[PDB]
Every structure is written in C-alpha cells, then in structure tokens.
C-alpha cells in the first residue's frame, strides 16, 4: 500500500470558538482528523500519526504510532492557550520526522492554521526554502481568516511547492456554514 508518515498541527487559540462560523469547529476538525486517520487506517494501517499543537511551548501530545485508540483520547484537553507559533511549529515536526520507526515511510505533514501568521515574508521564504530544500510534502490548510485569505501565502506555496508533477496541493476553504470535512476531502490528499 502507501508507506508514509502523517503529522497534523492543530490550533489551540481562542480564534476557534467564534460564533460566526461553525459551533466550535475544533470538534469538526477533530472529526476531520478522525476520518483521515481512519481513512489512512483503511488504506494502510501501518501508517503512524502524530499530534502536536502550534502554541508557544509546543508539546508532543502523541508519538507517531498507528494505534489511534489512545489518540482519540488525546484529542481532548486541548488546553486553549496561546495564539500562534509558526517557526518552531514547522521545526518541531519537520525535524522530528527522523524519529520515526519505519525509514521507508515518506514524509507528509499537514497543519490546521486558525490564526493569522505573525512571521514576515522573509521567514516565509526561509522556511519555504528549508522545506523545499529537504523535500517534505507540505499541505497547508487555513481555517478562518481576518484579512484576505492568500496574499503572500500564494507565493509562499508556489515557492514552497516543488516537483510540480503530482506534488503538494493547497487547501483554501471559503466561508460557509457547511462542514469542513467534505471540503478538505475534495483534493487527492484525503484517500
């Protein structure tokens, strides 16, 4: 089947409980993690899935393991503190990819971004140059917005996305009362 590692980064800021969008969509994207981990489990149950947030003091909630039975429990107690942290959020997983058991598992990291990015374009091109340098599949998922959705993040992805053939895809969700599961399951990354 498919031998690859899955890393998800979820936001724990207070920007995920606003009443305009879904009613505390944290549970909705939790169900998204549930359907992508159970979908990858149905495709290849040997894939390991890690859990970590993007707070100031990043903490590895669950080590990369195919057993999601305790991951379901670890998805709770999100500790809604902090706002956003991007640099050590990338470096806390993309550098931790070397601690996986199976060396044959490809590198794939996703992230749920629910807060505006605090890093300037220089950090976007330095981190994009680092990720394109080490050649890691990066899927950017941006939930919620305050300013325009993609102004510098467009060039961030275009400069970050190498190997145009069957490479990485960008997930941009527009506002709407519909669920996010079917909207993020539309690209080829899900399934």
């Amino acid at each position: 089947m498919v031998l690859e590692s899955t890393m998800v980064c979820v936001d724990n800021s207070e920007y995920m409980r606003n009443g305009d969008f879904l009613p505390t969509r944290l549970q909705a994207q939790q169900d998204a993690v549930n359907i992508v981990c159970h979908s990858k489990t149905r495709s290849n149950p040997e894939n390991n899935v890690g859990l970590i947030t993007l707070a100031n003091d990043c903490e590895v909630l669950t080590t990369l393991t195919p057993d999601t039975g305790r991951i379901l429990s670890k998805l709770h107690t999100v500790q809604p503190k902090g706002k956003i942290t991007f640099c050590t959020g990338i470096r806390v997983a993309h550098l931790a990819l070397k601690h996986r058991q199976g060396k044959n598992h490809k590198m794939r990291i996703i992230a749920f971004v629910g807060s505006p990015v605090e890093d300037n374009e220089k950090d976007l091109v330095k981190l994009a140059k680092r990720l394109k340098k080490e050649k890691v599949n990066v899927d950017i998922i941006n939930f919620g917005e305050e300013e325009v959705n993609t102004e510098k993040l467009t060039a961030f992805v275009n400069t970050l996305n190498g190997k145009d053939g069957t490479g990485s895809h960008l997930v941009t969700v527009p506002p709407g009362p519909s669920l996010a599961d079917a909207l993020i399951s539309s690209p080829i990354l899900a399934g």
Partner: protein, 50 residues
Amino acid sequence: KIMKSEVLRVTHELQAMKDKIKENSEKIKVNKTLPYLVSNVIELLDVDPQ
C-alpha cells in the same frame, strides 16, 4: 454543558486504567499459582516507632 465536557477525558482515563490492569492483574495467576508448602502463622502486632 461546556463544563461537563471534561468528564469524557476522565472516563477515557478510567477505561484506560481498566485496559492497563489486565497485565499487572494477569501476573496474579502466574505468581499466586501454587503455594508449594504449608506454614503455620502466629499473629503478633509490632510497632515501628506512614
């Protein structure tokens, strides 16, 4: 019901305890299998000065 949403984590910890007691409770059968001899017991209360 937002304050009562933390009970799920407690129930997950308790069912995790029920999932983890099977090993340390399982060694009871191999450690407490058979007393090989018989020994008389005489009760005598002692004092240490928990």
